[PDB]
Scaffold this active site. Structure first.
Site, mmCIF file in Angstrom:
data_model
loop_
_atom_site.group_PDB
_atom_site.id
_atom_site.type_symbol
_atom_site.label_atom_id
_atom_site.label_comp_id
_atom_site.label_asym_id
_atom_site.label_seq_id
_atom_site.Cartn_x
_atom_site.Cartn_y
_atom_site.Cartn_z
ATOM 1 N N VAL A 248 95.868 59.303 102.470
ATOM 2 C CA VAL A 248 94.820 58.313 102.690
ATOM 3 C C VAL A 248 94.841 57.833 104.127
ATOM 4 C CG1 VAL A 248 95.930 56.098 102.302
ATOM 5 C CG2 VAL A 248 93.619 56.493 101.474
ATOM 6 N N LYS A 249 95.518 58.588 104.982
ATOM 7 C CA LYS A 249 95.546 58.316 106.402
ATOM 8 C C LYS A 249 94.810 59.434 107.137
ATOM 9 C CE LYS A 249 98.416 55.669 105.493
ATOM 10 N NZ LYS A 249 99.435 54.935 106.220
ATOM 11 N N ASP A 250 93.845 60.045 106.457
ATOM 12 C CA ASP A 250 93.047 61.104 107.047
ATOM 13 C C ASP A 250 91.644 60.614 107.330
ATOM 14 O OD1 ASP A 250 94.877 63.113 107.382
ATOM 15 O OD2 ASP A 250 94.456 64.082 105.461
#
Ligand code: HEM
Ligand code: HEM
Lengths: 507, 507, 135
Positions: free
Chosen positions: B77-79
């Site tokens: 979810v850090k993309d």
């Protein structure tokens, strides 16, 4: 009693026959709802990714496309197979909840069926050849499915093969099944109903070539039949690993090694679902050609895709050399990299199996790679003992004019390193007081490096640890009956100093 | 010179102000094209999965849903952060192709930025605390990004913290940008523009609760502001690991452990983007609960998600106890399991760090788990030397009714085991001839097991190797120092025999 | 001077017998070793070639300690000093013993000093280094 998997197909499908003659159920690829009822509905409609640098580097005049089928639930292209087979088995009434599902697997089919079982409660028994990575085991144990391994080099028909164990198990335990991915018609049907439809809809049905690996027989047959039924001009290539018997004609099979390091493709028999007549030409590919292209895929396009895609793009950079402007090449990328993290992604394993050579490892590195660390500016005139107080160290280090110092015991056993800035920040934050000993703020992680080792080793050590403590050790002899070993810190290096040195030498 | 990351927010946003007052460009989502121009377009519109067994087991009367944000390109979810920050920087013109992008990260912004860099050519340098798994180092090396590690327990403000090293690098390397995920407004803005919109559209904007991890500040603030603006009734919760300072009020933070084994949540400061006042209540979660719930997620719903997805549901099975029928709970699952394969997925590491007790791992096992292996029927009356011919072996074994035999050298070293059924198939296939020695058909791999070890150890050995050779070794003394060693094959056991024994004893 | 092939993996104590020395240095493949006391103070150097000649000459016997053959004079040189300083040192003394010294603190005033031999360089090695680097 046992049924061979290599028996010739009884299927009567032939090009041009209307779908109304199909005895098999066809499932509508209806779009999933806004809330998936469970993870199993995230299987289908994977993206179609254009690939830029590889196609340009190796002179492909045609646009090269990749179908990323590693964003399925389990991370593979063997997740349409599990869903379709379970759906069909339940629909036909051959299966009931609580049954035991045995399935010999080349890998990812095991994960897919284990996931479907764990979701729907079935007890799953997966049989895998012993060569498959342990990362496909650790992801199975967590799923709780039982796992049974078989010898790597047993011929399929022999009892010890990875189908002989499966069939024997299906007979020992009552109320058990073998969905038989090799023979079940639902295997290629899944692709013929979803994989082909998605490709046709995304690519406008105007693709002049395809590529795809083999080893199950499904990904190629199930797509080829539909492509030729609706896109007759598509040239349908195949692939296979050197050491397998799937490839035809026989000339290309004349190699002797019975084991190969690609996981999931090739076999020592022709699976029944493998409809070879649809292929238009078979190539081959070998381990190193596959790994050295998987690595470059990852490095140059961000397609996090595993081993069985290296071969599938290697074959592409050859078979499509004759294409022209305006035509499209479509490939299949079976699985996600999660299953090979200790394998080819690991430099250690790649060099150990020699698919790379050291000159390949150094040619790409900057000039300073071979300079000995002895050439850096490094020193440590002072040292500290663990018993000192932090208040004493804060003054000692500043009065000496140095911002950091090693921590050593009475005899020489290195314990860690202490830095001024962190000590002052800890004092200000109240975590420690000036009277408190340094033992609560000492850095305990580091790695020794000896003067001779090149800067390449230093750069590969700083990827794990901030501090590389350059040290030197000596053996001392008394009479050959008494001896002692001693070492002393000889300054430390860090990424900051390494880059500063490189800049200064450049500047 | 250096700028702290914990400085108070300068933002002026407040609930109820019209969106026209936003000084920041909003990138309205649009229908993705049929062919992704490259991988970076597979970031957005991840599925929403209802979760059945966990919600029912722990008494959740409400519909418990999960936002699976581990099917982004990099598996995290850090993309959304990596894509949004790079795109905004380029749009602003602050960046030019070929520049060096330095980014301190907890591990997943690292992978995202490494991918979004290798796709566009930027030279990426990622600073990462030492505690993060090596499975992210391996995935970073393949991407070719430079990596720099920092001490685990360095205070954020100290020069040796990851932010400190990042800024020191940026201050020396020419043509270098530090995007500073902790302070960039694009970090939470990415979620506020895409994450919130997808949740609102999928769930019909009728969710009465939410959960989310913290440690960046983005996932919670960005979703919270939009949810409050358009879904005012949502009860927004936070989470944090015991040992972090982010959680409020201060009464909950009174614990002293400075290191925790969850990768990527919590910190020793308040990031500037973290808009805490949007939270409606906080909790805490500790390592063991998170890992146990991650395992019981994987094993019972097929939702492959990693460590930070354990805390984010362990918190839900408490905070949502007060909900009633008809209301929806929505959670956020940061990362994919690919980054923890050596960690909690590995029973070895779990027991080593004691997050499981042996009785926990043994209670659920069937009755026979504690029996000793000698309880089985096992024997090995005969043996064959490696020099024998296959023709001799196939006649030796068949006449006696036995079908397999160990291979023992002259001294007693166990070499392997040969099965009659495989030998016959090898002869029929032409790979060997009767005059040929067994050296070409002997199985090369096996694992030893001793008579004292329980059947549990045997079942955990059969997950790696087909054959478990029950051997025995004796030390023999001529006179004190002139010792010698010897070993013999007592019996061989395989999954077939173990299961047959269990079935027979049961019956 | 740190750019040379200086090294010193092993050391001996002054009380060692000459037989032990002649066997240790040969079985380890080396020919010379610093002589260091218990506290770490450098005392001198001993060379296999000279010891064997002394044995053959009868001046010492294998049971005899090395104290009768230890070279007594040398000069320290630190790794920062240029090769010019090394050359102006070798005009006076055969051995230039490269060493490093560290101050160790227990608590401010209760200080202590330590040192160790990192390598030994001689005119032979300096000239060989120049020749090889040029070639
Ligand atoms: C014109 C359409 C089709 C016709 C005329 C047809 C005919 C048949 C028949 C009669 C069988 C049963 C044979 C037996 O039980 O011995 C069969 C099985 C099978 N069909 Fe089809 N079918 C059609 C559609 C398809 C499609 C679309 C596929 C795949 C894309 C397919 C692949 C198979 C397979 C793999 C089997 C099982 C072969 C085996 O178990 O050995 N069929 N087919
Ligand atoms: C009514 C809408 C908004 C207003 C009035 C507003 C106003 C502002 C202003 C004037 C700044 C610059 C402050 C400075 O440079 O010191 C700023 C920065 C910022 N805004 Fe907004 N903005 C809006 C929209 C948003 C949204 C939608 C978000 C997140 C969901 C957001 C989060 C931030 C953040 C994180 C910063 C950076 C603060 C810092 O770097 O110290 N803003 N805002």
């Amino acid at each position: 009693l046992w049924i061979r998997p290599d028996a010739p197909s009884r299927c009567t499908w032939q090009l041009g026959r209307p779908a109304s003659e199909s005895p098999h159920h066809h499932t509508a690829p209806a779009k999933s709802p806004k809330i998936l009822p469970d993870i199993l509905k995230k299987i289908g409609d994977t993206p179609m990714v254009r690939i830029n640098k590889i196609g340009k580097k190796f002179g492909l005049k045609c646009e090269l496309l990749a179908k990323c089928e590693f964003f399925n639930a389990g991370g593979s292209v063997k997740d349409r197979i599990s869903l379709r087979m379970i759906e069909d088995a339940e629909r036909d009434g051959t299966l009931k909840p609580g049954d035991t599902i045995i399935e010999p697997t080349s890998g990812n089919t095991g994960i897919g069926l284990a996931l479907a079982a764990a979701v729907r409660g079935y007890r799953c028994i997966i049989v895998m050849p012993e060569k498959m990575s342990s990362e496909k085991v650790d992801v199975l144990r967590a799923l709780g499915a039982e796992i049974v391994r078989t010898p790597t080099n047993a011929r399929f028909d022999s009892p010890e093969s990875h189908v002989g164990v499966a069939w024997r198990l299906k007979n020992e335990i009552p109320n058990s099944h073998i969905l038989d991915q090799y023979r079940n018609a639902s295997n290629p049907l899944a692709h013929y109903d979803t994989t082909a439809d998605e490709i046709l809809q995304q690519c406008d049905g105007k693709l002049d070539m395809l590529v795809a690996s083999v080893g199950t027989g499904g990904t190629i047959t199930g797509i080829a039949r539909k492509l030729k039924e609706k896109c007759p001009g598509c040239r349908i290539i195949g692939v296979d690993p050197e050491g397998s018997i799937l490839a035809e004609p026989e000339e290309l099979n004349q190699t002797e090694q019975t084991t190969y390091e690609v996981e999931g493709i090739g076999y020592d028999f022709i699976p029944t679902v493998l409809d070879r007549t649809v292929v238009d030409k078979w190539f081959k590919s070998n381990d190193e050609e596959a790994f050295t292209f998987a690595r470059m895929l990852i490095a140059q396009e961000g397609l996090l895709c595993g081993g069985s895609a290296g071969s599938t793009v290697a074959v592409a950079v050859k078979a499509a050399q004759e294409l022209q402007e305006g035509q499209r090449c479509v490939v299949i990328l079976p699985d996600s990299v999660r299953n090979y993290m200790t394998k080819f992604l690991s430099d250690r394993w790649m060099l150990q199996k020699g698919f790379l050579k050291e000159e390949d490892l150094t040619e790409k590195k900057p000039w300073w790679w071979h300079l000995r660390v002895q050439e850096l500016g490094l020193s440590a005139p002072l040292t500290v003992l663990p018993t000192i107080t932090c208040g004493h160290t804060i003054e000692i280090l500043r009065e000496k004019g140095f911002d950091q110092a090693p921590v050593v015991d009475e005899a020489g056993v290195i314990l860690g390193m202490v830095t001024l800035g962190n000590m002052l920040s800890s004092l200000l934050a109240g975590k420690v007081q000036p009277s408190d000993q340094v033992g609560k703020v000492i850095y305990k992680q580091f790695k020794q490096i000896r003067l001779t080792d090149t800067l390449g080793r230093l750069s590969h050590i700083l990827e794990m640890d901030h501090f590389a403590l350059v040290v030197h050790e000596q053996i001392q002899y008394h009479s050959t009956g008494k001896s002692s070993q001693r070492q002393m810190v000889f300054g430390v290096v860090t990424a900051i100093d390494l880059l500063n040195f490189v800049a200064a030498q450049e500047r």
